Design a protein around this ligand. Structure first.
Ligand code: CA
Ligand code: CA
Length: 472
């Protein structure tokens, strides 16, 4: 069996995923994008899970909570954004979420990690602070919750941009066992970008998307930084104070990795956390598709937590949860690319830029039958474009069968590096119609593990749906 990135099937769009192991299964609790979506998080919340010892087998557990279950949202006019789920000290499962830019944290509850969740309440002040009202201060946003090893419960939230009233950083408070009532007014624990100036956090301040995990006895607080495309971490010995800046864990364009400035893949917001599954640690994040920020898909990479507690930045890959490189036999969707750029790939996220519409991008097209019949492919491939995959175990590979279409007149080169300097083969591209076709490209690749890159040079545009390995 094999698994790639994204780990859920290509017709599923679960960004903002919080990974938790419950009763032997790794559940992912994210928001819910739609293919071709026109706004953030348009679907009801679902969950998917794999056995914790076999992360290559994900199954769909259904919708677990709907937009209209919150009393603030009777017509479902507002979306539900990035959630978190904790097993509370009472043994039940508590789901925390905010409606789209609504300044309250809602809470639902179930006895099962797969639902059904029923509305529980809104996070609120105790009777003696602010008349016990619903918490609406310091911009409630992107909630994350920890049920600690001793049974205490801590909430983390906030929205702190640098670009009404917003957060100065990540805010935090301990909740009572009702899972609604804070023990005290929330306080800041990680500085936002503004307050980050002068600190070790400088340039990587808190922006959104906290995720709290226990690593041994330590508290690891991940967040999406002011850069938005990266996930950073801070570490403390205490849950609500004393956080020291860690570093970057993952960027969805590998920005920052080895000082890289030009992204390897279209940048966008990023959300997620770490999890211990098997004997290893993973980071879950999401990627962008469709040339927008509204069709996002969960990905993951193994990480290493060093003996001193630090977590070096990891590169994005196509094999993610596979536990090793993929087989260089059989057929693959082009949509599992972890490298995807052209001459318009932006260094600064800007989804208003009209160049996004005509940029190289992964898209989906509904087809007769099930979602598994839907076509995924890369469109808008022109000269200067590069498409890349990590990693394959090449054994006796003689050729590649590329399924393409379009009106392109030029050269498709094949290489093992993104700079296209380790060239292993190439094809003349003579297609000026509009029906799919397979092109065999002979390649001289020595056996062993390699990345795989396709580079296009010339005029026209092409679309790329699948590639297959031709072995001896
Ligand atoms: Ca879906
Ligand atoms: Ca979250």
């Amino acid at each position: 069996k094999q698994i790639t990135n994204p780990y859920l099937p290509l017709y599923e769009y679960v960004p903002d995923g919080e990974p938790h192991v419950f009763d032997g299964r790794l559940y992912i609790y994210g928001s819910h994008d739609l293919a071709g979506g026109t706004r953030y998080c348009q679907g009801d919340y679902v969950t998917w899970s794999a056995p914790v010892d076999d992360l290559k087998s994900w199954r769909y557990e259904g919708v677990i909570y709907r937009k209209d279950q919150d009393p603030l949202n009777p017509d479902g006019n507002m979306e539900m954004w990035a959630p978190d789920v904790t097993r509370g000290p009472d043994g039940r499962y508590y789901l925390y979420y905010c409606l789209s830019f609504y300044p309250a944290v809602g809470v639902a509850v179930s006895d099962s990690p797969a639902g059904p969740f029923q509305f529980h309440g809104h996070v609120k002040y105790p009777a003696h602070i602010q008349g016990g009202k619903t918490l609406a201060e310091f911009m409630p946003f992107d909630p994350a919750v920890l049920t600690d090893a001793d049974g205490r419960v801590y909430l983390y939230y906030g929205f702190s941009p640098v670009k009404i009233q917003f957060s100065e950083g990540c805010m935090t408070a301990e909740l009572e066992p009702d899972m609604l009532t804070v023990k005290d007014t929330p306080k800041m624990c990680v500085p936002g970008g503004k307050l980050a100036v002068g600190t070790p956090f400088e340039g990587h301040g808190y922006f959104e998307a906290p995720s709290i995990r226990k690593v041994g006895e330590k508290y690891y607080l991940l967040y999406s930084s002011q850069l938005s495309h990266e996930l950073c971490y801070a570490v403390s010995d205490q849950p609500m104070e004393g956080y020291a800046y860690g570093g970057t864990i993952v960027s969805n364009g590998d920005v920052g990795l080895d000082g890289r400035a030009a992204p390897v893949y279209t940048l966008g917001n990023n959300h997620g956390g770490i999890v211990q599954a098997g004997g290893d640690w993973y980071v879950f994040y999401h990627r962008q598709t469709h040339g927008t920020e509204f069709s996002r898909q969960g990905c993951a990479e193994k990480i290493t937590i060093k003996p001193d507690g630090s977590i070096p930045q990891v590169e994005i890959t196509s094999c993610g949860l596979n536990g090793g490189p993929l087989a260089a036999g059989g057929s693959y969707s082009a949509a599992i690319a972890c490298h995807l750029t052209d001459g318009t790939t932006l260094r600064e996220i800007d989804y208003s830029d009209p160049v996004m519409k005509t940029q190289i991008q992964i898209t989906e097209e509904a087809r007769d039958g099930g979602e598994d019949k839907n076509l995924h492919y890369i469109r808008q491939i022109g000269g200067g474009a590069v498409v890349g995959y990590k990693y394959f175990d090449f054994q006796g590979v003689m050729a590649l069968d590329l399924t393409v279409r379009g009106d392109a007149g030029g050269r498709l080169a094949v290489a093992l590096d993104a700079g296209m300097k380790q060239a292993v083969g190439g094809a003349d591209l003579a297609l000026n119609g509009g029906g799919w076709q397979t092109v065999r490209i002979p390649v001289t690749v020595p056996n062993g593990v390699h990345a795989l890159y396709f580079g296009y040079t010339g005029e026209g545009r092409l679309e790329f749906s699948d590639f297959a390995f031709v072995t001896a």
